Design a protein around this motif. Structure first.
Motif, short mmCIF file in Angstrom:
data_model
loop_
_atom_site.label_atom_id
_atom_site.label_comp_id
_atom_site.label_asym_id
_atom_site.label_seq_id
_atom_site.Cartn_x
_atom_site.Cartn_y
_atom_site.Cartn_z
N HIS A 64 -8.34 -11.68 -0.14
CA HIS A 64 -8.97 -10.55 -0.80
C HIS A 64 -8.31 -9.27 -0.33
CE1 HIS A 64 -12.63 -9.20 -3.10
NE2 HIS A 64 -11.90 -8.12 -2.90
N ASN A 65 -7.64 -8.59 -1.25
CA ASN A 65 -6.93 -7.37 -0.91
C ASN A 65 -7.81 -6.24 -0.46
OD1 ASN A 65 -4.03 -7.54 -3.13
ND2 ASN A 65 -4.71 -8.83 -1.45
N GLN A 66 -9.07 -6.28 -0.87
CA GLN A 66 -10.02 -5.24 -0.49
C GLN A 66 -9.50 -3.84 -0.79
OE1 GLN A 66 -13.14 -5.53 0.39
NE2 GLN A 66 -13.05 -7.78 0.25
N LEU A 67 -9.34 -3.03 0.25
CA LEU A 67 -8.87 -1.66 0.08
C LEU A 67 -7.36 -1.47 0.08
CD1 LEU A 67 -11.40 0.61 2.00
CD2 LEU A 67 -11.50 -0.33 -0.30
N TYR A 68 -6.65 -2.19 0.93
CA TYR A 68 -5.21 -1.99 1.03
C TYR A 68 -4.28 -3.13 0.63
CZ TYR A 68 -7.53 1.69 3.61
OH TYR A 68 -8.40 2.71 3.95
N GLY A 69 -4.77 -4.36 0.69
CA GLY A 69 -3.93 -5.49 0.34
C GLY A 69 -3.06 -5.29 -0.89
N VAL A 70 -1.84 -5.82 -0.86
CA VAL A 70 -0.93 -5.69 -2.00
C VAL A 70 0.16 -6.76 -1.97
CG1 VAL A 70 0.68 -4.08 -0.86
CG2 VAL A 70 0.55 -4.12 -3.34
N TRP A 71 0.23 -7.55 -3.03
CA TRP A 71 1.28 -8.56 -3.11
C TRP A 71 2.54 -7.88 -3.63
CZ3 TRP A 71 1.40 -13.40 -1.22
CH2 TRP A 71 0.19 -14.08 -0.99
N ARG A 72 3.69 -8.48 -3.37
CA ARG A 72 4.96 -7.92 -3.80
C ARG A 72 5.93 -9.04 -4.04
NH1 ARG A 72 5.06 -2.50 -2.16
NH2 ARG A 72 3.23 -1.64 -3.27
N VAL A 73 6.57 -9.05 -5.20
CA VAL A 73 7.53 -10.09 -5.46
C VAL A 73 8.93 -9.56 -5.19
CG1 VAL A 73 8.29 -11.80 -7.07
CG2 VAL A 73 5.96 -10.90 -7.17
N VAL A 74 9.70 -10.34 -4.46
CA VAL A 74 11.05 -9.94 -4.11
C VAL A 74 11.97 -11.11 -4.30
CG1 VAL A 74 10.24 -8.23 -2.49
CG2 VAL A 74 10.59 -10.57 -1.72
N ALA A 100 -3.35 -6.97 3.88
CA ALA A 100 -4.64 -7.64 3.75
C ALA A 100 -5.20 -8.21 5.08
CB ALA A 100 -4.57 -8.74 2.69
N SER A 101 -6.52 -8.37 5.13
CA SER A 101 -7.21 -8.91 6.31
C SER A 101 -7.98 -10.16 5.90
CB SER A 101 -8.19 -7.88 6.88
OG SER A 101 -7.57 -6.62 6.99
N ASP A 102 -8.58 -10.12 4.73
CA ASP A 102 -9.35 -11.24 4.20
C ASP A 102 -8.41 -12.34 3.74
OD1 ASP A 102 -11.54 -9.43 4.48
OD2 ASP A 102 -12.53 -10.28 2.71
N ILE A 103 -7.96 -13.16 4.69
CA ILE A 103 -7.05 -14.26 4.39
C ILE A 103 -7.50 -15.55 5.04
CG2 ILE A 103 -4.65 -15.00 4.43
CD1 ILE A 103 -4.02 -11.97 4.95
N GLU A 104 -7.66 -16.59 4.24
CA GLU A 104 -8.12 -17.89 4.72
C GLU A 104 -7.45 -19.07 4.05
OE1 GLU A 104 -12.46 -18.09 4.98
OE2 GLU A 104 -12.43 -16.14 3.94
N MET A 105 -7.31 -20.18 4.77
CA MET A 105 -6.75 -21.41 4.22
C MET A 105 -7.97 -22.32 4.07
SD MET A 105 -3.98 -22.63 3.06
CE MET A 105 -2.45 -22.07 3.82
N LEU A 106 -8.30 -22.70 2.83
CA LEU A 106 -9.48 -23.51 2.55
C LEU A 106 -9.23 -24.91 2.02
CD1 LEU A 106 -11.41 -20.75 0.54
CD2 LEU A 106 -11.86 -21.38 2.92
#
Ligand SMILES: [Ca+2]
Ligand SMILES: [Ca+2]
Ligand SMILES: [Ca+2]
Ligand SMILES: [Zn+2]
Length: 257
Positions: A64-74, A100-106
């Motif tokens: 969950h990106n929440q406030l700052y998270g951001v994906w980037r393709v390179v 991001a901070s909200d990161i989990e492996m489920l």
């Protein structure tokens, strides 16, 4: 609306391609890195403003990106002030999760019990969401015993469902709002499972600009929404509607039961 675009970017970049390198910043996750090499992203499901990246080994990265998270393709090689959290890399592309901070492996079992996840169900306009998947959800212990009247109004079940789609959906499979997924034969269950996606996608795929109706009727016509007092294209009964009410229900007392 169409915010489900970030997921397409990631799928469009690394989906199907075998992961040649996987890296995680969180120590608790380092244990999944080597396990994924060789694996690929089957797809990326959206859930509210979160992303569920599924892998070919049944694992799922929640983020969950929440406030700052951001994906980037390179490009595999292309390597800025933000701190990297995740790095999934294929031969040509590499997607990166920054800040991001909200990161989990489920694991599959932890999907239905996750706090956020059990608050927002898959979106009906999500290509990857299939009828077979909706039926499963319909039959899971969590919903199988809920009246459709409110269930089709509950975003925790499926995202993208308004009252105007609830009534249309129920009228197409001839059901009143007091039924449960548990009072349905196999065929009835499958009919609704397709309804929940078809009319919502049909409704949207053909929406027209505003005030356009002044000179042209939409291809998608409502059968019972705002049609109380008019006959039912099916049997001819006068369509009724509840007051007493959360969201005004609409149905044909004639062919819906
Ligand atoms: Ca309908
Ligand atoms: Ca026109
Ligand atoms: Ca019935
Ligand atoms: Zn009717």
């Amino acid at each position: 609306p169409e915010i489900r675009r970030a997921a397409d970017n990631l799928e469009a970049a690394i989906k199907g391609k075998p992961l040649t390198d996987v890296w995680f910043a969180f120590p608790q996750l380092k244990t999944y890195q080597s396990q994924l090499i060789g694996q690929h992203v089957t797809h990326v499901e959206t859930r509210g403003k979160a992303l569920l990246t599924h892998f070919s080994n049944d694992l799922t990265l929640y983020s969950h990106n929440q406030l700052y998270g951001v994906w980037r393709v390179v490009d595999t090689g292309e390597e800025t002030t933000r701190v990297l959290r995740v790095k999934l890399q294929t031969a040509d592309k590499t997607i990166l999760l920054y800040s991001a901070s909200d990161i989990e492996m489920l694991r599959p079992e932890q999907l239905t019990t996750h706090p956020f996840l059990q608050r927002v169900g898959p979106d009906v306009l999500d290509p990857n969401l299939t009828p077979e998947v909706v039926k499963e959800r319909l039959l899971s212990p969590r919903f199988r015993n809920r009246q459709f009247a409110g269930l089709l109004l509950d975003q925790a079940f499926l995202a993208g469902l308004g009252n105007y789609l609830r009534v249309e959906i129920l009228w197409q499979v001839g059901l009143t709002g007091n039924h449960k997924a548990k009072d349905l034969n196999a065929a009835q269950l499958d009919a609704l499972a397709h309804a929940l996606l078809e009319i919502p996608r049909f409704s949207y795929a053909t929406r027209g600009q505003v005030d356009e109706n002044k000179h042209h009727g939409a291809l998608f016509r409502f059968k019972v929404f705002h049609r109380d007092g008019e006959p039912c294209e099916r049997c001819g009964s006068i369509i009724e509607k509840t007051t007493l009410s959360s969201r005004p229900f609409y149905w044909c007392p004639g062919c819906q039961h």
